[PDB]
Design a protein around this ligand. Structure first.
Ligand code: CLA
Ligand code: CLA
Ligand code: CLA
Ligand code: CLA
Ligand code: CLA
Ligand code: CLA
Ligand SMILES: CCCCCCCCCCCCCCCCCC(=O)OC[C@H](CO[C@@H]1O[C@H](CO)[C@H](O)[C@H](O)[C@H]1O)OC(=O)CCCCCCCCCCCCCCCCC
Ligand SMILES: CCCCCCCCCCCCCCCC(=O)OC[C@H](COP(=O)(O)OC[C@@H](O)CO)OC(=O)CCCCCCCCCCCCCCC
Ligand SMILES: CC1=C(C#C/C(C)=C/C=C/C(C)=C/C=C/C=C(C)/C=C/C=C(\C)C#CC2=C(C)C[C@@H](O)CC2(C)C)C(C)(C)C[C@H](O)C1
Ligand SMILES: CC1=C(C#C/C(C)=C/C=C/C(C)=C/C=C/C=C(C)/C=C/C=C(\C)C#CC2=C(C)C[C@@H](O)CC2(C)C)C(C)(C)C[C@H](O)C1
Ligand SMILES: CC1=C(C#C/C(C)=C/C=C/C(C)=C/C=C/C=C(C)/C=C/C=C(\C)C#CC2=C(C)C[C@@H](O)CC2(C)C)C(C)(C)C[C@H](O)C1
Lengths: 170, 129, 194, 42, 107, 181
């Protein structure tokens, strides 16, 4: 009848809690129009990019490879635009995203979970129960990292200080 | 149903939804209550490091008003979902009390802002002078 | 019923683990569109040419036929320096080999018209090295894998010869990195031409 | 991929426009890298 | 008064780059006659950044109209009694479309 | 010995922090139920077991070699051709230049091509049922019953210890910049 997250809003019809991390939060009604599978594909893909990027920031201030010049991550974006390594990374992301297009076609055809690439080399998921717990954690971390990366880049744009140095100063 | 003194002389309720009208009245009430409590508060005390209408103009340059607008706008977008859904589809005493106090605050703030246009003074300053 | 190569995709039909190197890798579903017999004939043919091509680049680095026209250590220069009459002789001989070895069943409408015809089996066993049936599975597997590897390796060597105008072994032994001043990728439409 | 969308891309105008755009595209690319070919060079 | 408006540049392919004539302002391109430059100066654009923002605004509107056509045919299609409101449509197209269009443009 | 259930056995975890995996059975020698990443489920156990023992033997030989060279113990005339320094890194570079490392490489690689690869492939395929790491090398015996239990466990544990030690020793030498002992 109503949403778990927003008490005064009604729970969206397409949000039945089947996807982990669901709390009924969809006021603008994007699930009433679009396929939720595609939207969870997009949520997990944006979030995984954001999580890799927030670790990307933190490690890039802490360390940089000796063959690459020491510099700030947004300056790293521009340097690797002009150097060629950005095009390398874009090509290899695009190459993986080809099979991601195939994977999304498998999701639309009903035969794949929206974020599952069966990528468990280290076997951390043991049974279904821990997989569900990890999955809820993954979506929560994905959403939190999407907000966090926007903060890290916007704070750098306003104050030309890196995230670790901005915590260190002020 | 709360705060019903039988006072609808122009009969607005006949030609607009009582739910949309009540949402507008209650939202105006609350906003006005915060505004009236705010007017007196600015004169009584100032948050560290920090005019009825001119201070708004100063704040937009400082971005203080702009940050408040963005966050209130996000809550309001969720509130727009709530208003559309409501239109589509102790505590009793407190609802009447909230409506009456909010109506008094609507008039209260209205008085404070016209007092500011007249003497250029805050509501506490109006009592002081 | 998932692929073993790509675990999150469904196992492709016409891939049933019978063929050597059938690890379940067809994400784009070309085997569902193109008959697997033609694709395995083409895969074996590409790989066999590439196995010779990889060996060609490395061996032409080490050993040359005599004479000044065959003295090009860098392999992409041998294309231009080698006598044209003989390179067109190679090309014509390849065309003759294609017509006789495929037995005039060359097209995608008449190769495998004989039900006895097998993908990749052109009848090539001069020394009867496939006379032992036991090695057939391993050999066919190792031919396919050697072919795939040589496709990847030759592709690398060519594009490393383009980037660094150096032959592959002496590019490994006199390695100079990519400066990025030149060899920029793309850019024909960014500057609007020129 | 959907079989009805692939059957739509197999329709005559789509294949005609894609094939003649591909045809036009390699005529354009061949005249970009190797322009002014009035003759077969021999 | 000296620079000639040009918003189209050709690629050099078959000698067709002769069409990038000297329109002025250190520029080569096809001279355009649609009067957009005079519209943009009348709007007060005075920057190419603001022209990029107008291009994005047009792109967002193009996406919203193609979405609205899909939505209003496939998700929520009005009934015939909705379309047969000529009084309501005229009230809105005079007041809302043309009237707030002029009012907002005058503003 | 084997001592199943106490060491080298089912229900045996060296670290209880990491749970005993079902995929790791007690059959392989020196199995202490240590598999946090669960490789045992998808890997070929015969291959990884043979690979483990070969790494162990290489490491134990590595530890003895590093200890002898670090101590300055040398074969007659060897110091003259090779590096005088007892640094393992310096000796290896000098040995490469002399050709000693090349000769060792040639013969080790030749053994692996002609014997190591056939033994590995036949063990995995099922042609000889070779026990992982078995190279039929018992010149002074010490095999039979002892080999099945204590000797196999002693080799696996000492070799794991050696692998860790050799790793430590080279990184100690790198960060310190000076050789051990
Ligand atoms: C005041 C309300 C209003 C407005 C602005 C419009 C506007 C429009 N209607 Mg109409 N319409 C209305 C009420 C309104 N309608 C009502 C009440 C009915 C029911 C009787 C209809 C029934 C109706 C039909 C049946 C048709 C239209 C069509 C059209 C479009 C005409 C083509 C054109 O010039 O677009 C270009 C001009 C523009 C301004 C494009 C902007 C597009 C948006 C929708 C305008 C409003 C945006 C928003 C309100 C502005 C917010 C401002 C903010 C930034 C501060 C135009 C978008 C025709 C059409 O083309 O269908 C799509 C058509 O067939 N309408
Ligand atoms: C294995 C396949 C492969 C190959 C052959 C290349 C080849 C190259 N990459 Mg790429 N790359 C790849 C995979 C590959 N990449 C993948 C999977 C990633 C991760 C997404 C990257 C990320 C990447 C970055 C970020 C950069 C390169 C760069 C380079 C260049 C290195 C120059 C050199 O030889 O000196 C270096 C020699 C060594 C590092 C020796 C080891 C070269 C064009 C760099 C470059 O300068 O591009 C112009 C660069 O900055 N690559
Ligand atoms: C809830 C609102 C709020 C709160 C808690 C504070 C609290 C504070 N502000 Mg902030 N400030 C506010 C609103 C607020 N301000 C607003 C609306 C503005 C206008 C945009 C500012 C502009 C502002 C400036 C410009 C500065 C502060 C500063 C300070 C600190 C001064 C400490 C002090 O004198 O305390 C009492 C302390 C004692 C009696 C003894 C010590 C304090 C942490 C100062 C600071 O430290 O910032 C770095 C400062 O320079 N504030
Ligand atoms: C109809 C038969 C015929 C005739 C008369 C010629 C005549 C000629 N050829 Mg051509 N050729 C032929 C068939 C023929 N060719 C075929 C079928 C091939 C393809 C395999 C070639 C490939 C070829 C190349 C690549 C070259 C020639 C060259 C020459 C010329 C110099 C010959 C010379 O000095 O020989 C005396 C020299 C020799 C006898 C040396 C032979 C070298 C060894 C045996 C090569 C190793 C063979 C190698 C393993 C190939 C195996 C694949 C094969 C079994 C399919 C001469 C005009 C050369 C040229 O134009 O130079 C100016 C040259 O570069 N030929
Ligand atoms: C095939 C259709 C077509 C095309 C491609 C063009 C192309 C062009 N027109 Mg034209 N136009 C057309 C049909 C077309 N027109 C029709 C049918 C009319 C009659 C309504 C006009 C009236 C018209 C005017 C009045 C103006 C143009 C202008 C332009 C140019 C700039 C495009 C632009 O942003 O306009 C932007 C348009 C403006 C900036 C001014 C718009 C003012 C009108 C009055 C707005 C009316 C909107 C309203 C919804 C109309 C409803 C119809 C009414 C009877 C109810 C460009 C050369 C402009 C131009 O030539 O500048 C050099 C210009 O001022 N057009
Ligand atoms: C298995 C390892 C091994 C063994 C058993 C030997 C044994 C020997 N070496 Mg040494 N040697 C070795 C490895 C070994 N070498 C290696 C790896 C190198 C190459 C780096 C050399 C380089 C080498 C040289 C250059 C010389 C020897 C010599 C000798 C002989 C002299 C012994 C003597 O008189 O005592 C000497 C006792 C002392 C000096 C102690 C005081 C002796 C048979 C000498 C020789 O040829 O004599 C026949 C000689 O001059 N060796
Ligand atoms: C019936 C056929 C019988 C054939 C018998 C012969 C063939 C038998 C099989 C042989 C298989 C190949 C074996 C090698 C043959 C040549 C031996 C040789 O001398 O090579 C020749 C070269 C060295 O060449 C040396 O050059 C010196 C001068 O510079 C010397 O003076 C000598 O000329 C020569 O010894 O060997 C190498 O380059 C080896 C490179 C390293 C190879 C691996 C080493 C061992 C593995 C550990 C590496 C770990 C690396 C981790 C990552 C590090 C990243 C930096
Ligand atoms: C199975 C075989 C797998 C092959 C893998 C391919 C490896 C190489 C692929 C590119 C590597 C990295 C590219 C960075 C290089 C790059 O992105 O350059 C950018 C270039 C456009 O130029 P820009 O607008 O970027 O100019 C940018 C400015 O910075 C400089 O002026 O993009 C292209 O269009 C070039 C490619 C040709 C596009 C058409 C190719 C031919 C079409 C044939 C049919 C389709 C085939 C597939 C098409 C995608
Ligand atoms: C360039 C570079 C690198 C990099 C990088 C990369 C790849 C970075 C990737 C970053 C990404 C993909 C960030 C994704 C952000 C998405 C956001 C914030 C979504 C917000 C949506 C919200 C809040 C909502 C909502 C909604 C919900 C759900 C319900 C609706 O009904 C309503 C509503 C609209 C409210 C790094 C940084 C490592 C450094 C390097 O040296 C250089
Ligand atoms: C068909 C196809 C495939 C394929 C393939 C491919 C690409 C095959 C390529 C085959 C090649 C490269 C054959 C090369 C032959 C070279 C010859 C005969 C050299 C002769 C030298 C001469 C006569 C001389 C001389 C002398 C001269 C004149 C003057 C001196 O100063 C110099 C010198 C002393 C040297 C395969 C097999 C993979 C699979 C499938 O079945 C489909
Ligand atoms: C079948 C048959 C028989 C036969 C026969 C024949 C002709 C057998 C020949 C078989 C051949 C030629 C096999 C060659 C494979 C080459 C490979 C896999 C190379 C891969 C290179 C890679 C991965 C790389 C790379 C590299 C990169 C890019 C970076 C570079 O800087 C360097 C580097 C090189 C390291 C006979 C005739 C005996 C009779 C019998 O009755 C039937």
């Amino acid at each position: 009848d109503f949403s778990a997250a927003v008490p005064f809003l009604k729970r969206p019809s397409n949000l039945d809690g089947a996807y982990i991390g669901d709390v009924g939060f969809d006021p603008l009604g994007f699930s009433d129009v679009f396929d939720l599978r595609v939207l969870r594909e997009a949520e997990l893909k944006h979030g995984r990019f954001a999580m890799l990027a927030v670790l990307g920031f933190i490690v890039q201030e802490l360390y940089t490879f000796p063959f690459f010049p020491k510099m700030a991550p947004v300056d790293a974006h521009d340097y690797f635009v002009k150097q060629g390594g950005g095009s390398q990374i874009i090509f290899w992301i695009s190459f993986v995203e080809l099979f991601g297009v195939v994977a999304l076609f498998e999701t639309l055809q009903g035969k794949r979970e929206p974020g599952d690439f069966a990528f468990d080399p280290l076997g951390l998921a043991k049974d279904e129960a821990t997989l569900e717990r990890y999955r809820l954690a993954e979506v929560k971390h994905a959403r939190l990292a999407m907000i966090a990366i926007g903060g890290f880049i916007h704070q750098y744009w306003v104050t030309k200080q890196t995230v670790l140095e901005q915590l260190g100063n002020f | 149903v709360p705060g019903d003194a039988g006072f609808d002389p122009l009969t607005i309720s006949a030609w607009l939804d009582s739910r949309w009208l009540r949402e507008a009245e209650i939202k105006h009430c609350r906003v006005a209550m915060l505004a009236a409590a705010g007017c007196i508060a600015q004169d009584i005390f100032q948050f560290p490091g920090a005019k009825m209408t001119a201070l708004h103009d100063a704040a937009v340059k400082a971005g203080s008003m702009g940050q408040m607008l963005f966050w209130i706008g996000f809550v309001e977008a969720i509130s727009t979902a709530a208003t559309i859904q409501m239109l589509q589809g102790g505590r009793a005493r407190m609802e009447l009390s909230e409506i009456k106090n909010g109506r008094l605050a609507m008039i209260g703030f209205s008085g404070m802002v016209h007092h500011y246009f007249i003497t250029g003074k805050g509501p506490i300053e109006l009592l002081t002078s | 019923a998932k692929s073993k190569a790509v675990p999150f995709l469904s196992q492709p039909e016409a891939l049933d683990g019978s063929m050597a190197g059938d690890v379940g890798f067809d994400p784009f579903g070309i085997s569902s569109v193109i008959d697997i017999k033609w694709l395995r004939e083409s895969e074996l043919k590409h790989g066999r040419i590439c196995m010779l091509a990889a060996t060609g680049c490395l061996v032409q680095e080490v050993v040359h036929l005599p004479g000044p026209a065959f003295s090009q250590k860098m392999a992409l220069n041998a294309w231009a320096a080698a006598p044209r009459g003989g390179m067109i002789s190679i090309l014509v001989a390849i065309g003759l080999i294609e017509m006789i070895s495929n037995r005039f069943a060359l097209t995608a409408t008449d190769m495998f018209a004989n039900p006895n015809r097998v993908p990749g089996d052109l009848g090539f066993d001069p020394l009867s090295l496939g006379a032992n049936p036991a090695n057939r599975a391993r050999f066919e597997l190792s031919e396919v894998i050697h072919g795939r590897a040589a496709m990847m390796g030759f592709s690398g060597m060519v594009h490393q010869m383009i980037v660094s105008k150096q032959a592959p072994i002496e590019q490994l032994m006199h390695f100079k990195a990519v400066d990025s001043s030149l060899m920029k990728l793309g850019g024909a439409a960014g500057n609007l031409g020129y | 991929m959907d079989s009805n969308f692939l059957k739509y891309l197999s329709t005559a105008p789509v294949l005609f426009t894609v094939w003649l755009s591909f045809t036009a595209s390699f005529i354009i690319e061949a005249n970009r890298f190797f322009p002014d070919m009035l003759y077969f060079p021999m | 008064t000296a620079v000639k408006p040009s918003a189209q540049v050709v690629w050099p392919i078959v000698g067709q780059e002769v069409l990038n004539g000297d329109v002025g302002g250190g520029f080569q391109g096809v001279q355009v006659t649609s009067g957009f430059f005079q519209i943009w100066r009348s709007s007060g654009i005075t920057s190419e950044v603001e022209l990029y923002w107008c291009a994005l605004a047009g792109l967002i509107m193009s996406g919203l109209m193609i979405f609205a056509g899909w939505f209003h045919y496939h998700k929520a299609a009005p009934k015939l009694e909705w379309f047969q409101n000529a009084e309501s449509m005229l009230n809105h197209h005079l007041s809302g479309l043309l009237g707030l269009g002029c009012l907002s443009w005058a503003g | 010995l084997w001592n199943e259930g106490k060491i080298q056995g089912k229900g045996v975890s060296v670290i209880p922090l990491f749970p005993r995996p079902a995929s790791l059975d007690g059959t392989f020698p020196g199995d202490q139920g240590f598999d946090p990443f669960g490789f045992s489920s998808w890997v070929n156990m015969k291959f990884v077991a043979e690979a483990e023992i070969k790494h162990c033997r290489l490491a134990m030989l590595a530890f003895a070699g590093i200890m002898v060279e670090s101590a300055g113990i040398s074969f007659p005339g060897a110091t003259s051709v090779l590096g005088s320094s007892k640094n393992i890194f310096e000796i290896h570079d000098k040995a490469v230049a002399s050709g000693a490392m090349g000769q060792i490489l040639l013969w080790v690689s030749f053994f692996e091509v002609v014997a190591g690869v056939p033994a590995m492939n036949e063990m995995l395929n099922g042609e000889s049922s070779r026990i992982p790491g078995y190279y039929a090398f018992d010149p002074l015996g010490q095999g039979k019953g002892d080999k099945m239990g204590r000797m196999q466990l002693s080799e696996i544990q000492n070799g794991r210890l050696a692998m860790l030690a050799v790793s430590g020793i080279v990184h100690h030498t790198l960060i310190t910049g000076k050789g051990p002992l």
